[PDB]
Amino acid sequence: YSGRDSLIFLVDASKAMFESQSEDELTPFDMSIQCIQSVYISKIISSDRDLLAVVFYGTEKDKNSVNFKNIYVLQELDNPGAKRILELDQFKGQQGQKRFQDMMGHGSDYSLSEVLWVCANLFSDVQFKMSHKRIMLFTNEDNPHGNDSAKASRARTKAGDLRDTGIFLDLMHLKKPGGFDISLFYRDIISIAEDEDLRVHFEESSKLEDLLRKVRAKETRKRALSRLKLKLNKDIVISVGIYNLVQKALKPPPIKLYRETNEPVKTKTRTFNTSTGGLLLPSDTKRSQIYGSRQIILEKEETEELKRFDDPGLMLMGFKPLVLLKKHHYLRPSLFVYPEESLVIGSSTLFSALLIKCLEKEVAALCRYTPRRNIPPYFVALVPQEEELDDQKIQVTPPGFQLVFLPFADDKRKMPFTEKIMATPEQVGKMKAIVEKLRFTYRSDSFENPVLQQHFRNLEALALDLMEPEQAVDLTLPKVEAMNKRLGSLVDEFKELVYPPDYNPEG
């Protein structure tokens, strides 16, 4: 865990945010609010347990507790909800903006120091462990608070103060026809870990394209599967963390709730004497398995100890070259092992030495693995995956041992096999050409389950109670027309090459 995330959005309640160079372009307030909607939807599906708030500045009215003028808070730091989405969308649009300007003011003098006070106080309100005091704001101009030198000085003083307090903030470039005026008033006063300010950005060219994009995932935090241990012989033991860099996600379980109250009704379940109508007890339980006629009775710890073979841990078997593993031999999704000094101190040194040595030897680690108590231990192989970096020196692959599992004899399922049949080499060349026609470079993040996407689409659609639900796009459908036009007549050429001209492959 080690902290949580929270963002607060700041919108200039002025008239510059309520115009457009051309009607094809929305107002700054318009694309800001729609990007806010997209961000909130993403947070709900991704990390709904975070904190989000909305505050406005420059408006005529105000709502902050300290009651600084022009400082109207809209929403406080809370887990996002569809109600907030509705509150935002009631003013999102070419007329909802007018509704907002009617029921709410816009355009007045203020001090950025005041909004910084308000946001700092809002930070003070939250109490859970917190890690990312990210602040987001939206405008296309900087100099209005540089107009008053005293206002500029106090604003930059408070900005330095909040930077000292660990607060991090980010601004979106908005389309100002005369240029946002980078480097004039903000990047010297705002918090940046890097400098790319080169163009005063007459347009809104910054990272809205990423933010408006909707993501659909869960992004489970880095949680150690176990600090399980490797028993070398009987006493040489090291502490290593267990991880799964891939973990099959699935649709969240439903919650059974009422009809007219919609309340999730608790469901107590028990067992009673059917022959009597009385009541039975968990102690009054006996499991049976009848093979033919004889009935055999087993109990709780009776069924437990049959699963008992050894203590949960890793028991080294030996070493074998990596090549001696058949690729088609697969059991289930692989695991990953990372060292740790939390329990066994110096175990990281041993892990590094083993990784380097076995990488030199090109050998695999054979070991007996017991996940937890009362489980049959299974043999596994630890292939050393070296940490690989990129042009950005980011870990495209972390260091450690990828944990692949070794199937047993029962796993092997033989099938009715046939003889070996060969093919003419010219047909093989035709296949090579046809493959080259439709070849491409695979990338892992280029594909996704459309079924869960459609599930989400429906979920937020009924949440947003529109006329129609959003339609997900299947990225797993082949481009049949594109592939066919890309191949040409080679398809039918090989069809007559191999398949009989009179007999189609269809029966």
Partner 1 sequence: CKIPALDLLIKLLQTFRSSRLMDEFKIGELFSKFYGELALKKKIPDTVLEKVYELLGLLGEVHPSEMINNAENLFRAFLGELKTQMTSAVREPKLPVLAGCLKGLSSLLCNFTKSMEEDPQTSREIFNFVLQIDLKRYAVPSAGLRLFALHASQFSTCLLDNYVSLFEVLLKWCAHTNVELKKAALSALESFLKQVSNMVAKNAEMHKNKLQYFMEQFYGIINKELSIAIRG
Partner DNA sequence: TAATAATAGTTTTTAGTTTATTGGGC
Partner DNA sequence: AGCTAATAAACTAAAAACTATTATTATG
Which residues here bind DNA, judged by CB under 7 A?
Answer: 1-2, 129, 220, 223-227, 244, 247, 250-251, 253-254, 269, 312, 372-373, 375
Q: For residues 224 and 280, which CB has a smaller minimum distance to DNA in the complex?
A: 224
Supply the minimum distance, in Å, between the C-beta of residue 90 and DNA.
Answer: 31
Taking the complex as a whole, how short is the minimal distance between the CB of residue 55 and DNA, in angstroms? 28
129 lies in the site for partner 1, by CB under 8 A: no
Cross-strand pairs, 169: 135
Binding window for partner 1 (CB under 8 A); candidates: 213-221, 276-284, 380-388, 461-469? 276-284
Q: Applying CB under 8 A, does 127 fall inside the site for partner 1? A: no
Q: What minimum distance in Å lies between the beta carbon of 281 and DNA? A: 14
- The binding track of 318-357 with respect to partner 1, each residue x by CB under 8 A or -, is ----------------------------------------
Phi, psi torsion values for 92, nearest 5 degrees: -80, 115
Q: Which is nearer to partner 1, 103 or 280 (CB)?
A: 280
The CA angle 78-83-88, to the nearest 5 degrees, is 90
State yes or no: residue 305 binds partner 1 (CB under 8 A).
Answer: yes
Q: Count other Cβ atoms within 10 Å, centred on residue 186.
A: 23
Tokens of 359: 């990488």
Among 234, 248, 259, 270, binds partner 1 (CB under 8 A): 270
Could you tell me the two tokens for 210? Answer: 């990423």
Q: Which residues pair with 47 in a beta bridge?
A: none
If one asks whether residue 301 binds partner 1 (CB under 8 A), the answer comes out as yes
Q: How far apart are CA 115 and CA 104, in angstroms?
A: 18
* 287 binding partner 1? (CB under 8 A): no
238's tokens: 């090291």
| Helix, coil or strand: residue 115 | helix
Between 105 and 371, name the residue whose CB sits nearer to partner 1.
371
- Which of 272, 330 has the CB closer to partner 1? 272
Residue 280 in the binding site for partner 1 (CB under 8 A)? yes
- State which of residues 66, 281, 331, 451 lies at the interface with partner 1 (CB under 8 A): 281
Rounded to a whole number of angstroms, the minimum distance from the CB of residue 228 to DNA is: 7
Instruction: Candidates 282, 318, 478, 501: give the one binding partner 1 (CB under 8 A).
Output: 282
CB nearer to DNA: give 213 or 373.
Answer: 373
Nearest 5°: the CA angle 67, 19, 17 is: 30
Cα angle, residue 395 at apex, residues 475 and 446 outer, rounded to 5°: 5
Residue 405 and residue 367 in contact, taking contact as beta carbons nearer than 8 Å: no
Alpha-carbon distance of 139 to 154, in angstroms, equals 20
Is the CB of 373 or the CB of 485 nearer to DNA?
373
Exposure of 226 in the CB half-sphere (CA atoms within 13 A): 13
Residue from 300, 320, 479, 486 in contact with partner 1 (CB under 8 A)? 300
Of the candidates 189, 221, 37, the residue with the CA atom closest to the CA atom of residue 113: 189
SS percent in the chain: helix, strand, coil, step 5: 30, 20, 50
| 480-487 helix and 425-437 helix, angle to the nearest 10 degrees | 130
Q: Which is nearer to partner 1, 248 or 286 (CB)?
A: 286
Strand partners, 136: 9, 170
Q: In terms of CB distance, is 149 or 267 closer to DNA?
A: 267
In the list partner 1, DNA, none, the entry touching 372 (Cβ below 5 to 8 angstroms by class) is: DNA
| Local structure of 387: helix, strand or coil | coil
∠ at Cα 78 (131, 95), nearest 5°?
A: 120
Is residue 304 part of the contact set for partner 1 (CB under 8 A)?
yes
By CB under 8 A, is residue 373 in contact with partner 1?
yes
**Partner from partner 1, DNA, none contacting 207, C-beta within 5 to 8 A by type:** none
3 state DSSP class of 243: strand
* Residue 265: strand, helix, or coil: coil
CB of 142 to DNA, least distance (A): 40
Partner that binds at residue 103, options partner 1, DNA, none, CB closer than 5 to 8 Å by kind: none
Can residue 298 be called a binding residue for partner 1 (CB under 8 A)?
A: no
Query: Which stretch in 140-148, 151-159, 262-270, 379-387 sits in contact with partner 1 by CB under 8 A?
Result: 262-270
Mark 133-164 as b/e (b = at least 16 C-beta within 10 Å): bebbbbbbbbebbbeeeebbebbbebbeebee
Q: Rank residues 65 and 247 by Cβ distance to DNA and give the closer one.
A: 247
Could you tell me which of 88, 96, 25 has the C-alpha nearest to residue 52? 88
The nearer residue to DNA, 270 or 393, going by C-beta atoms, is 270
Q: Which residues in this chain contact partner 1 in the complex, by CB under 8 A?
A: 268-271, 279-284, 300-301, 304-305, 373
